[PDB]
Structure formats: structure tokens, C-alpha cells
Amino acid sequence: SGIVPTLQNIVATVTLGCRLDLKTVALHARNAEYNPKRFAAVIMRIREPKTTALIFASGKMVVTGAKSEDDSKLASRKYARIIQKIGFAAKFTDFKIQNIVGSCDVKFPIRLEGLAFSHGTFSSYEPELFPGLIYRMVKPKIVLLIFVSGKIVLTGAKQREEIYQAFEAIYPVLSEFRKM
DNA sequence: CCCCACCCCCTTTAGTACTTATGCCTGGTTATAGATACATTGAAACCCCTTTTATAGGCGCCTTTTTTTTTT
């Protein structure tokens, strides 16, 4: 294909192994918002790497927004370090990436309804609901959002390799339905 | 002094008409069992809260601009 999808977002979970007083975290950490009435967790953001963590009373958290596996682990470590610095027996445990999202640009337009009619068992296209075509790939198990513009969204991957393999697999069919 | 006649009685049983109690059946409302109106406390079942990064239509709602109609 000659193109390599760009990783745009990585979601990871981390068990800090120790109960937390969310009310206290929200009070001593900067850039933290806590509104239990709507979500039972403290939302905290940091600038390097630019990410957002969801911290729970159970001591477990979700780190989002990271653009690489390293930034994800690194950011996760900083959040844990803050929880500690606040006064908890937090530890960096069970780090695990749960989802990777990537995007592409094949540069050419795509006749989506032709692609949907051709691959009916994998794609759901109804512009009324959503402008992009939803392609549910089997191997690897990656969901793609194909747009008329040639823009491609790939998600559902746990290894960055799946995004790459998903894109290579779809390129031929994308090319086949190129508007030209 | 004797004979005959008249008066007074008790004997018990058969008749059908009339009165009283029992069985009959009949018009209210009261006392029973269960469900209904429904209302009870009990519980489970439900949506709700922390965000990200990109794609791109439709969606509703804001203040400022231009056009049309009315009045003087």
C-alpha cells in the first residue's frame, strides 16, 4: 500500500493496588475534577505525555490519550507517582493496553455504497445515521470506519500490529472502490 | 189397700262443624368465604458518574444582517 496508519489513541488500565479516597485525591492533585454525582471516579490530566486518567476508589485506573505504548506506560507511572506523592500506598501494577486506535488517508475518494453492497456481511453503511461505513474485519478483529474522503479509522486493536495488518487487508478493497 | 200413670235419671256413643298447631312455601336483610379495589413494605432492576482522538454528515439554538410591510 505504501502507507502506515498513525496511532492516535491508546487506552490502558493499571491496578495501583490500594484503596483510594477520591475526595482527597481531587483535593490535593492539580487539574483534577471529581463529581461523584455523575461518575464515581477522579478525572485527572497531565501534559507529558498529554493524557487523561480515570482514577477509582478501588485503586484502579484507566489512562487514555496516549499515542504510543511507551507514552502510555510512562503516563501511567506519573499518575501512580502523584497518587503516592499525595499519600497513598499506590504501586504501578498490572499495566495493560486495552485498545489502540489509528487513522489513515489513502488520498483518494471512495464509493462507499458500492463497498457496502459488495461486502454486506462485514460493512454497515447508512449515511442517515453516520456518514462513514463501518467495516467489521474478522482477521484481525479490527473495526474500521471508512469515509468518502479516503480517511480511515481503525480501532479495537490490542497490538499496534493489528492496526497495520487491518489496513493492509482493507487497502485492496478500498482501491477497488476508488472513485475515478 | 192395690193398680195405673206420670215424672226424673243416668247409660254411653255417633255427627259434623270449628279452632289450634305443624309443615308448607315465600319476601327482606344479615352473617361467611373469597376476590377486588387496591394500598402495603419489600425487593430488585435501571441508568448515572471519570475521557481520549480522528473521521464528517445532521441536530438544535445564538446574535447580527438583510428584506418586506406598515404607518405617518
Swiss-Prot record:
Disulfide bond sites: none
Annotated localization: Nucleus
GO molecular function, one term: RNA polymerase II-specific DNA-binding transcription factor binding
Sequence repeats: 7-83, 97-174
Main subcellular localisation: nucleus
Example GO biological process: nucleolar large rRNA transcription by RNA polymerase I
GO CC annotation, single: transcription regulator complex
Keyword presence, Hydrolase: no
Keywords: DNA-binding, Nucleus, Repeat, Transcription
Family to which this protein belongs: Belongs to the TBP family.
Its biological purpose: General transcription factor that functions at the core of the DNA-binding general transcription factor complex TFIID. Binding of TFIID to a promoter (with or without TATA element) is the initial step in preinitiation complex (PIC) formation. TFIID plays a key role in the regulation of gene expression by RNA polymerase II through different activities such as transcription activator interaction, core promoter recognition and selectivity, TFIIA and TFIIB interaction, chromatin modification (histone acetylation by TAF1), facilitation of DNA opening and initiation of transcription.
Subunit structure: Binds DNA as monomer. The 1.2 MDa TFIID complex is composed of TATA binding protein (TBP) and the 14 TBP-associated factors. One copy of each TAF1, TAF2, TAF3, TAF7, TAF8, TAF11, TAF13, two copies of each TAF4, TAF5, TAF6, TAF9, TAF10, TAF12, and three copies of TAF14. Interacts with TFC8.
Name this protein carries in UniProt: TATA-box-binding protein
Organism (species): Saccharomyces cerevisiae (strain ATCC 204508 / S288c)
Underlying gene: SPT15
